[PDB]
Amino acid sequence: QTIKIGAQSMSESEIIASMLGQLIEHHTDLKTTTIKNLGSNAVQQQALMNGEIDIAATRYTGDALTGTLRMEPEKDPDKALALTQREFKKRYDLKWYDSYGFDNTYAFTVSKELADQYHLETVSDVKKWAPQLKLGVDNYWMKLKGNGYQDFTKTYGMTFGGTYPMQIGLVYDAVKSGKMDIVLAYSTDGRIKSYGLKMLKDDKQFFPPYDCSPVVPEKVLKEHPELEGIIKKMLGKIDTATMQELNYEVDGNLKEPSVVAKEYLEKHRYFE
Ligand SMILES: C[N+](C)(C)CCO
């Protein structure tokens, strides 16, 4: 009546936002709409504080610790989540829920062929090769201040010989085809498994945890007391394997995110 749910410009965020909206409409007389194409963690933040969205469907602890809170990035998942929950309530009167069950981290990714030829297992293993590698990346990370490229080169001490910003969606074919040698992929993309790509271990733990949760203002929860119980039904229920399969249905089987969400909810009987 009517609850506006924000989605970041990722297939994953569209699937989860549609799944949550469908679950609310299954249980209650609330109407839901989806506010798509929010560009970033910061965009979703300001939209929560100014009333443009009532629920942010997918927020990530690693994005909010650096970007929003300007805290030093905690590297343990459970600690990072508890610190995020605490500060979001204190600073913003926002409720950062427990995780849906999956984490979507940046991951340096190569073809199995390249990994096998040069015995690549970790990010540190590419240090000696960096000047000769072509890196594909999304359109934000090169300029990102927390754990973006600037800080990466300082921490790992390597600089790639060529950089190639593109829509996140495009990196998977770029690396499989061999047009790029290495890409900064998102770990829940379903093409990593389907294309047989190799994720390199972040041995320095340069990246923080990116556990995913819904975030809602306390004022919205007070006015709609049934929302809390509905959101709880999705928590702890969607593991990374499941999220990759759902992303695959959109990016590989070319389904609408609303259709992928409706078929999952039907298969799993709306979580009860
Ligand atoms: C959540 N990621 C780390 C994959 C992308 C930035 O929102």
CATH number of the domain bearing residue 258: 3.40.190.10
CA 265 to ligand 1 center in whole angstroms:
25
CA 165 to ligand 1 center in whole angstroms:
15
For 172, the enclosing helix (H) or strand (E) is helix 171-177
36 with 117, same domain: the answer is no
Residue of 52, 54, 56 lying closest to 68 (CA atoms):
56
90 with 204, same domain: the answer is no
Q: Please, are residues 270 and 237 in contact by the beta-carbon 8 Å criterion?
A: no
Q: How was this structure determined?
A: X-ray
Q: How far apart are CA 82 and CA 194, in angstroms?
A: 34
46 with 92, same domain: the answer is yes
Q: Please tell me if the CB atom of residue 100 comes closer than 6 angstroms to any atom of ligand 1.
A: no
Distances 211 to 40, 92, 219, 236 between C-alpha atoms, Å:
16, 20, 24, 11
Q: How far apart are CA 6 and CA 179, in angstroms?
A: 34
Compute how many other C-beta atoms are within 10 angstroms of the C-beta atom of residue 120.
Answer: 21
* Residue 163 dihedral angles phi and psi, to the nearest 5°: -120, 145
Half-sphere exposure of 78 (CA within 13 A, CB side): 0
93 with 1, same domain: the answer is yes
Q: How far apart are CA 174 and CA 164, in angstroms?
A: 10
Residues in the chain: 272
26 with 67, same domain: the answer is yes
Resolution (A): 1.6
Q: Is 72 exposed, middle or buried (0-12, 13-18, 19+ CB in 10 A)?
A: exposed
The encoded tokens of residue 77 equal 């998942």
- What range does the domain containing 199 cover? 105-209
Atom of ligand 1 nearest to the CA of 188: 4
257 with 235, same domain: the answer is yes
For 87, the enclosing helix (H) or strand (E) is helix 77-92
Half-sphere exposure of 132 (CA within 13 A, CB side): 6
Number of compact structural domains in the chain: 2
Q: How far apart are CA 63 and CA 219, in angstroms?
A: 24
Would the CA dihedral through 22, 24, 25, 26 be positive or negative? positive
Q: Please, are residues 136 and 171 in contact by the beta-carbon 8 Å criterion?
A: yes
Ligand 1 pocket test, pick from 44, 58, 106 with the greatest ligand atom count within 8 Å of Cβ, gives 106
Atom of ligand 1 nearest to the CA of 138: 5
CATH number, domain with residue 182: 3.40.190.120
| Opening angle at CA 265, ends 214 and 259, nearest 5 | 90
